[PDB]
Each structure stands twice: as structure tokens, then as C-alpha cells.
Design a protein around this nucleic acid. Structure first.
Ligand code: OZ1
Ligand code: OZ1
Ligand code: MG
Ligand code: MG
Ligand code: MG
Ligand code: MG
Ligand code: ZN
Ligand code: ZN
Lengths: 66, 47, 261, 242, 261, 47, 242, 66
DNA sequence: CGGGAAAATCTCTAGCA
DNA sequence: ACTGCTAGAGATTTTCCCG
DNA sequence: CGGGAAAATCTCTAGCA
DNA sequence: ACTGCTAGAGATTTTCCCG
């Protein structure tokens, strides 16, 4: 039930930016998706990012490679 | 309170001081003589 | 410093010397010299050296008009993916822009558009089209092209591709469509190593899938978490950390000093 | 890795596709595809169909995505090959279009349309369109009073059909369905790409006979030898190109 | 890859796809796709993302003309220090530029000037003035203002200072001289925390002093050093390292594997 | 030998290939149809 | 640090300036200045002198740096206060000009020149100029045939005088001398600045009576107490402001 | 004789740049000055810099502070 | 573990009126 | 109350590959 | 050694047609 | 064969200062 959906959501990759950094940070793991905020985990670091600074994909090249 | 010195519309001159009404990331909202303007923070200085 | 300060103030009123010069020439602390400069309106001629960041939400589109060979090309870009749409139009008219936008809204899920303050984009016809299509309008700060930097860059990119294929088409409209095709499906890069079309499909499908998944999870998972405070709604937990939403303020706390009911 | 034996047993019992088994048993999709395609007993997104219709003396060119019901319709000045070629080049630039079905009309069989298809890499072949035209005409009749011109009403009808009309198995709309179908097509193309990369390799493990390569990941190396999939560590295997 | 390569070449001839796209769509190594792109003249539309560095030798001056209030200001800058000279002139004439340059050469040690290719700077009169004053002329690459970036920046700076003091002067020439004064002696910063005048005095005095000191040292210190080679002239030694000049090629070697006679 | 593709004088178009005669830091000297040009390395690509 | 005692002995024996002793005994210039100025028995760069001359019906305005012999001369349209003010503002912007000597002429005593001096911070006061004018006229006569106009010949003469004429104690030119003198003036101003910063401090060492501060460097703290310079470590001293 | 002149030359500060770096490197110590090249020492690192990339000063604020 | 080649990531720039 | 970016040419660092 | 304030260094941008 | 830079507004890191 819940655990399968949870793992499915963590299967999504997130590219984000910070307030003053113009470089997009690498593909963090998605944990929660809200209306205006997204909760991600980037190398054992949990961050909360505004929706306006987050691109959430799946990366199909990679899903199909493992 | 803050003093804002800005640059609004293709005018190379700098104006101010104006009352800072709002501050965001990359832009500010100021009031200069009952005229509210929105200026990118690249073209503004807040003191 | 009273004597040195008063001397420095007159010296600045004459020469508008910077804080370093007055500190060196009147034996002033850097704070006092900086205060002397900061109180002169004639020296406030520079803004902070940063940049903002445009909205990148999945429903965000940036529209602009560019000019090529004496003709007008109306271009929209999906900011999240870089997927472009372009059409050559007879004139920079409000009805032409409204027709373009109605087509775009009927073909893709457009929730808001970000345009500059050109006369066509500010027309009442475009406003009515946006109202009918359920599109919000965000207008950039006037004379600030950086506010729509994405589309601006796309303009350049689009023109570049046109310059590569102009001999393959006799009209400009056909070359514009060729360039749109090439950008959307023949150029690979970006976050997923994607094309723009692949990336936009991924972005939209991911939005739908994540929405449905989170809806089901919040339907099943239902808990209230106390920490340190009121009954914050549980959002996520694990690995010794719990993310909660207390009074519409999402925050991360360690698993220690936290109870879940 | 560990779930290959369970996956083969599950496939033998139910003949399930690779996506379900790859999701259930945490296997890379290449291995799941291999065990799906190793049993002889267990053995669209790019096709659009176009037609020109008429309403109020205006010819409307309509393309339908067959798999999803997605429509792209616009009012063209005249039922001419040039307008059809422009419409098709636009559609190919907006969506992945591979095959187009027409009705041997004068415009669709023109040299301009053929040249456009050749440039865009679209294949030309000569009942969904009739029902879709009927639904489009119904929607246009419903929203005609909201627009002075026919082109705007056509675009409003396209908007309503693609995003404001919901039905089917899951109660989705045509735009949602087309995005889902194209995403699946992207996944299929990526999987085929990876199979193409790894089919040119040969693995010698433990040395035994040549074997095809399936996976080379973080844990170990998964190969297939004599219709039997095995897993071996790196130092116990040698991967070469033939 | 022969089949995939030939397919990719036709695909590129149609669409001019980048190496990533053809590698993804024809199963090509990145080297081969990059070679396919690199062999198409229609895709070579971008230069390398770097910058040069202007000459900063002590005898280096950069000259330019700027325009303010319908009048012409001829500006020179000493690149090493940032010390400026400026004069308002009736017209952008060759004789006016030659007179300005003769004044500059008579007041400071000017060894060469770096100007763009404006008509006044390329005039025969300026060439004769430079020949009489012993000044070499280095002309920038045409339509490349960055080649004289220093003076360009100074232009902006100079104008800024004029904008600060324009009310203190009724003519523009007086305000220009006020701005020159303020820049040269009332603005502090740079490498030595200096003013431009202090920095130029330091640069020139240091050049003279170091020249005389090194002349005396080379007069006294006279040795030949072998290393690893021929009798390289000794330049400097100590701290386990010896800097030598072998066949007009200055090089640093460790004290080990080196003999001094 | 090298192929140089450049951009010389206020022309947004790119030309080439040309023979690379000299390479420095920040600029190159090339020959395009018996015409020797000096181009900043910002406006040139060497292959 | 260690060389203070030797430096005082050397000063008592020869009454040398601080620069020589600071160079010889590796002391900070503040300490050398202090021991130079502590003996009662051991006790220009900004002054320019201007005049207007005449040649071929043209008035040439000449400023001489008295200390070095450096000249700035140019042909002005008329012997008027406005031209003099413009010339002086230019000179003040090109060199550090503090005092100007004139000859009570109509132009030099004008309100425009006074206002220019006030803005530029130049003091006005009312034989070198005569000799300098003679030398300038001689050089102009020598290089007249090389220029059609008088202004160009004047500038050529200024060039020759400032850089191509070498003489004096060291065989230098006027430009070299003026750069050396201004560099020395910069050093003097910096030393005075530092003395001004450190004269407002009081040091209590070992606690003993209040002492003035001389140096606070890398090694230790050098102070002066009862006309005797001492050196103490940081933790054995306390520096405060009064 | 020679040693005093050598120390005097090392008393000069050099600000330099490298071929591809647009940032001026800090005040290295001057060791040798040539027609077109300058030999400097920057934090126990001996470098040879073209004259066109070197600004040699003395820093009078600092000579007079020790 | 040692290099070595290939991939990946980082740096930086023009052009977008 | 809004907001520079994007894609390519090199340069430098990481990673995979076999012994 | 521990913070804390002041200095110094680093980052980054507009304007120079 | 020639060549972006400069100075100011913040931000972040180093250093001096006293216990
Ligand atoms: N100057 C315009 C630019 C433009 O300078 N680009 C270059 C450009 C420069 C920097 C950058 F970071 C991005 C860029 F792109 C541009 O791109 N577009 O689109 C424009 N469109 C409309 C109008 C005029 C609007 C009518 C008056 C409205 C007043 O409220 C001006 C422009
Ligand atoms: N465009 C000129 C600029 C100029 O764009 N500045 C802005 C500018 C932009 C970028 C930069 F990094 C530095 C800058 F300063 C400039 O500054 N000056 O001085 C110029 N001077 C003369 C001529 C025309 C020369 C006559 C034709 C010669 C052909 O051989 C053009 C220019
Ligand atoms: Mg626009
Ligand atoms: Mg634009
Ligand atoms: Mg110029
Ligand atoms: Mg210029
Ligand atoms: Zn001021
Ligand atoms: Zn190409």
C-alpha cells in the first residue's frame, strides 16, 4: 500500500536552485511534493525548495537503465 | 526605515531616496513622491 | 574625530571622495568614512551585484516577439523544459497574440504567461483570451528584458537555427517551423540529457503522476506530529528526520524531540 | 539480482509484461524484457490521422492522435497542398509524428506535402476522424456565440476537447492521455536504445561459452547463457565486443 | 557504426543536430558524433569562452575619444596605475590628437599608445607626433573595444565623476578637469590602496629604482651556471633554487644538479 | 593544419574555414582567400 | 627591536636623519623618527611658480616645479584670468599642487583664479622662473623649424626640457627628479599619517607609568617612556586610547 | 655591497596575472627584473612572469609601517 | 592500486532591440 | 507586490578498465 | 583557546557607442 | 603578428583583541 507509493515518489529526480546561486543543483531525490514547496534529499541533506525553483523529472534514460 | 536609490526606465540617471515598501529576491517595491515603482534589485541600492 | 570628520565632509562636498580616500586623508575609521559617503545622494549611483531567478513552475510560459527579415515571429517557451512554439504573424497585434495564446492554451496546459509590456501583450484582447483560457498574466518590470531571460535566450537560439536552415525553405514561415522542429527534437542536453519535447513530456507526466501519488499517500498516511508545539500535520518521516507542516510553515526536525500519533 | 528466479516463475504462471515484473521484483528493465521475450508462449504513439472538413464556408484542417484522441485543428485559407504542408510541418515540430493517415485527397497527395513529410521524416499512408469531426463540430456549435470569428471558435473547441472533456477508463482528458502515451514511447525508445548498445557485447564467465550481456550495474554482472540467466561478479567475467 | 554513421550524417544535413542528439538517436560514440558536427561548416557559430589580457607595461598608455553634451573629450589612461588625462577638444581631428599626445609625452614617460582605429588616431599627423616623441603605436583589432577595456572603463568612470560635479562648473571643460582631479587624487583603492596619482608616482619611481639597482647588481654579480647544458648566465640564487637565463630562455632549477663558477 | 571559423567586423555571420597563420593569447592571425585577418580568440573557433 | 641602542648611539655620534638609520639598522621608520626628534641638538614638493611670457606675439603660460625644475608650459589665447584658472585647474589635476607663486599680475589676482585655487585647495602667494623662461625660449628657438605653429614648438620644448635634458648631482632629468620628489613626499605623508594614528594611544608596561606607543608589529611592542625607548611583549603591556 | 642591493630589490612588491586568470595575484616578492620578464617569489613559489602582466610597486604605506 | 582513456562536471561567453 | 538564461568550447576532475 | 568585532578578501555587475 | 576592465555593494573568510 503506502510503502510502494512512497518508493515510487522517491524514484523522481529534482533539479533545484537556491536564492542567490544561479547554478542548478544536481538530481536530488524527491520526498514530498506540495502546492508551493517541495521536500527533497540531496546527499543525506534534507532541503525544502520553493516550487518556482524546482524541476521534477524521472529521467527515463536512467529508469530504463536501473 | 530605508533609503532606496534606484534607476527605473531607460534613464541613466539615478533617483531617490524613496521609501522601501517591499523587498523580494531580485526586485523591490518603493514609493517616490506618491508614485509606487517596482525596480529590479540590480538597479537599486538600499541603505 | 570631530575636526577630521568636519574637514572630510567639506572635502567630500567638493570632490565626492570615496570612503577609502577620506579615511586615508583625515585619519578616519572606515565606518565613519563609509557613513560620510552613504549620506551623500550624489554618490548613490550603483545597485547590488546580483541577479534574480525567474519562476520555473511547470505551468510557466514566457512569450515574446522577435523580428527577422522584416517579419514578426511570436515565440513562446516553456520555462521548465525549454520547449518552444513559434509563429510568423503579419503584425504585432493584440488579436494575433490572443489567437497564438489560445492555440497554445488549447495544445498544452498553460497556467500563466510572462511577457514584457509591449502594446500587443497589454491589449484587452489578450486579457480576454487569458481570462477565457484560465491563464494568469505576469508582466515584467518595464525595460528589464532579463525578467524574461529564458525566452530572450530562446530568441537567439531560434534565430541561430533559422540561420542554419534558411536555404532549405523559401518562405520564412517554413524556416521558422523547421527551426522549431529542430530545437524541440534534434538538440539534446539539459537536465535529463533530453530534447525539449522529451523534457516537456517528462515534466508534464511527472507533474500528473506525482500529484496523483501524493494524493493517494495523504489519503492513506494520516498522522499528527508534536515537536519540541501544536499538532503539526505529518508530511514525511524517516532516517532520523521528520518533515512537518505546522501552521502552513513546512519545517524539518530531527526524530529526537518529536512524537507521532 | 536475487529476484530473477522469482520473476521467471511469476512470468511462467501469469505471462505478465516486463513493466509489471520489473516494478514488482526490482529488476532492471533489460532483464525483465529478456525473460519476457525468452518465452515463445508469451508472444501507435506516432500515428496521426488528418482530414479537411467544412463549416460556414471555411475549411478546417484536423489532425487526430489516434492513441489518445488528442486533436490539433485550425482554419486554413484554402484546401491547398501548401496549407497542408505548413500544418503538417507545424505538427511535426510540436509532437513526435511518424505516420500520417489521409484520404487520397488532392491536397494530401501533392508534391509539397510529400516534400514536407520527407523533410520531417513522416510516413504517408492512404473511422476515428469522422467521430472526432462530429464531436469537434458539436463543441464549435456550443461555443460559437463566444467568438466573432470561426478560427477563434475552432481553437476554443480544441481547448475544450483536449483539456475540458474528461472520460475513458481513468476519467482523464486527451492531453493527459497523449502526454502519458508519449512518455511511455520515450521509455520504450530508451529501452530499445540500451538493448542496441548491449547486444554487441559477449561475456565469458567462470572460462565457459560466450554469453550475451544483460546488465552491468553496481552489484554484479547479469548475463544470459544457453537460455538461462546468471549473475557473476566482475572479476569472474570478461566483457568484450564482437 | 557505418550504417548509423551514414544515417546520422543525412540526419545532420537535414537538421544540423548536435553531437548529443545523434549519439542518442543513432547509438554513436561521443567522439564520432562530435566529429560529425565538427565537419559541418554550418554549425561553426561560436568562439571559445575566454578573454585576453591587455598589456600592462609601465610605458603603456590607452587613448580614446568619448562624447558628452555634444562635445568631444580625448582621454588617455596609464594602464599600470589608472592615472588619467582628459581634454575637451573642438573636433575629433588628427592635429588635435597629435597636440594632446605631444603634451602627454612631454609630461610623462610615454613609450607606446594603444588606440582603436578611429580616423583621428590613424592620421598621419599623429604618426609624425609619435615618431618625433619616440612613441610606438599599437592599434586594436577593429570593432573590438575590449582591446582597450581599461580606457573604456575609465571613460565610464570619468563620465560618472562629471555627473557628480557638473553643477560646480559652468563649462564642460572645467567639469572635465574637476573630474580628472577627483579621479587622480580623491579616489583611493587598487593594488596599493592608492590614488591614481600616488600609484603612478610609485610605478614610475619603482621602475627607475629597480632598473638602477639591477644594473648595479649585474655589474657586481657575474657568474656562469651549468645545470643538468651550456654556461647559462646567473640571474638569481638562494633557498635551494637558482633562476638562470640559458640562450635567452629564463628558467628555474633546483640548487641540486647545478654548479656555479 | 587547422580550420578557423571567425567573425571579423560587425558582421553577425560566421565565415571560414581559414588557414591559421599565428596563435596568441586572446587573438589569432588567419588567412582567408589571400586576405590576412587578425581576430580575437573570443570570435574564433579552431579545429 | 634589537638595534634601537645601536641606532641611538649612531645618532648621537653623527646626527643622521631617520631614513639612513632606518635603512642601516632595520628599524620601522616611526622609531627612527622618534629617536631623531628626541634630540634637540639634531633640530617644497607641492610648490609651483607660474608666470606668463611672450614670444612671437603669443602669451605662453609656464609653471615650474621649484624643487625639480619640471615645467608645464602652454600657449593660451590671451593673458586672461579664465585661461589662468583653466591652466591651474589642469595642473592641480595632474600633479599635487599646494602652493603657487605669482607676480601680482592682473590675471593671477583675478576672482576666477582665486575660486579655482579655493576649489583645488591651492594656496596663493605673491628668480627660478626667469632662468627657466630663458632656457625654454632657447629650446623653442632650437626646435622652431620642426613645427609650423608655436604651440607645437612649445610642447616639443617642454618634452625636451623635462626628459631630454640631463644634469645636476646625479645626471637625472627633470621628470625623474619630480617623480622622486613626489615619491618622497608620499612617504613623508604616510609616515605622518601613521604618527597621527599612534599618537593617541597610551601604553602601560610591566604596571609602570603611561607611555606613548611607537610600534606594534610582529615581534613585540616598542614604546617610549621618560625619554627612553623600550620593547615589551604583548602580554606584558596594555594599549588603550585617551 | 651586493647583499644590500639584493635586499633592496626584494623589498619591492609585485602584482601579477597568469595567462588565463583575470584575477591579479597578490603582492609577491620581486627577485629579478629583466627587459621582458620578471622573476618573483609568491609564498615559497618562484615564478617567471612576462613584463606585460606585472605591476611592480613598493607600497609606501607599508614601507613606512615596517 | 597505477596509469590511461573516456565520461562528467565545471568555467565562461554572446546574444537575446 | 519580482527575479538572466542557454547552449557550446575548452579545462579540469571523476570514473571505468584492465591488469 | 572562545567568541566578537573589525579588517580583508572574494563575488559579481553596469557601462564603457 | 594580440589580448576586458574597474570600482562599488554585499557576502564570506581572516585577523586582532582581550580575557
Ligand atoms: N529592449 C527590448 C529587448 C532587448 O533589449 N533585448 C536584448 C536583451 C538585452 C539584455 C537581456 F538580458 C536580454 C535581452 F533580450 C527585448 O528583448 N525585447 O523583447 C523587447 N521588447 C519590447 C521592448 C519595448 C517594449 C515597448 C515599451 C514598453 C514599456 O513598458 C523592448 C525590448
Ligand atoms: N563601438 C565603439 C565603442 C564601443 O562600442 N564602446 C562600448 C563598449 C562595449 C564593450 C566593451 F567591452 C567596451 C566598450 F567600450 C567604443 O568605446 N569606442 O571608443 C569606439 N570608438 C570608435 C568606433 C568606431 C571606430 C571607427 C571605425 C574604425 C573601423 O576600423 C567605435 C567605438
Ligand atoms: Mg519583447
Ligand atoms: Mg526580447
Ligand atoms: Mg573609441
Ligand atoms: Mg571607447
Ligand atoms: Zn558625494
Ligand atoms: Zn550542421
Amino acid at each position: 500500500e503506502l510503502q510502494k507509493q512512497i518508493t515510487k515518489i522517491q524514484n523522481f529526480r529534482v533539479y533545484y536552485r537556491d536564492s542567490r546561486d544561479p547554478v542548478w543543483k544536481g538530481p536530488a531525490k524527491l520526498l514530498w511534493k506540495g502546492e508551493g514547496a517541495v521536500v527533497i534529499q540531496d546527499n543525506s541533506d534534507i532541503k525544502v525548495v520553493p516550487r518556482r525553483k524546482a524541476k521534477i523529472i524521472r529521467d527515463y534514460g536512467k529508469q530504463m537503465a536501473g | 526605515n530605508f533609503r532606496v536609490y534606484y534607476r527605473d526606465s531607460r534613464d541613466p540617471v539615478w533617483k531617490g531616496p524613496a521609501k522601501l515598501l517591499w523587498k523580494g529576491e531580485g526586485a523591490v517595491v518603493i514609493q517616490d513622491n506618491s508614485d509606487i515603482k517596482v525596480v529590479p534589485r540590480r538597479k537599486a541600492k538600499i541603505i | 574625530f570631530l575636526d577630521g570628520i568636519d574637514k572630510a565632509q567639506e572635502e567630500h562636498e567638493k570632490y565626492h571622495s570615496n570612503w577609502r580616500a577620506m579615511a586615508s586623508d583625515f585619519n578616519l575609521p572606515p565606518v565613519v568614512a563609509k557613513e560620510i559617503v552613504a549620506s551623500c545622494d550624489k554618490c548613490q549611483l550603483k545597485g547590488e551585484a546580483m541577479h534574480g531567478q525567474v519562476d520555473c513552475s511547470p505551468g510557466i510560459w514566457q512569450l515574446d516577439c522577435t523580428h527577422l527579415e522584416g517579419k514578426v515571429i511570436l515565440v513562446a517557451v516553456h520555462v521548465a523544459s525549454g520547449y518552444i512554439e513559434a509563429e510568423v504573424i503579419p503584425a504585432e497585434t493584440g488579436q494575433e497574440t490572443a489567437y497564438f495564446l489560445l492555440k497554445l492554451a488549447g495544445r498544452w496546459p498553460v497556467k500563466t504567461v510572462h511577457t514584457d509590456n509591449g502594446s500587443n501583450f497589454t491589449s484587452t484582447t489578450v486579457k480576454a483570451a487569458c481570462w477565457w483560457a484560465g491563464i494568469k498574466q505576469k508582466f515584467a518590470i518595464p525595460y528589464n528584458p532579463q525578467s524574461k531571460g529564458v525566452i530572450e535566450s530562446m530568441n537567439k537560439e531560434l534565430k541561430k537555427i533559422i540561420g542554419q536552415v534558411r536555404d532549405q525553405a523559401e518562405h520564412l514561415k517554413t524556416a521558422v517551423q523547421m527551426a522549431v522542429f529542430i530545437h524541440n527534437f534534434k538538440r539534446k542536453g539539459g537536465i535529463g540529457g533530453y530534447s525539449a519535447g522529451e523534457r516537456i513530456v517528462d515534466i508534464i507526466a511527472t507533474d500528473i503522476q506525482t500529484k496523483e501519488l501524493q494524493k493517494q499517500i495523504t489519503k492513506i498516511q494520516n498522522f499528527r506530529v508534536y515537536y519540541r508545539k501544536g499538532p503539526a500535520k505529518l508530511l514525511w518521516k524517516g532516517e532520523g528526520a521528520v518533515v512537518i507542516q505546522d501552521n502552513s510553515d513546512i519545517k524539518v526536525v530531527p526524530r529526537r524531540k518529536a512524537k507521532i500519533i
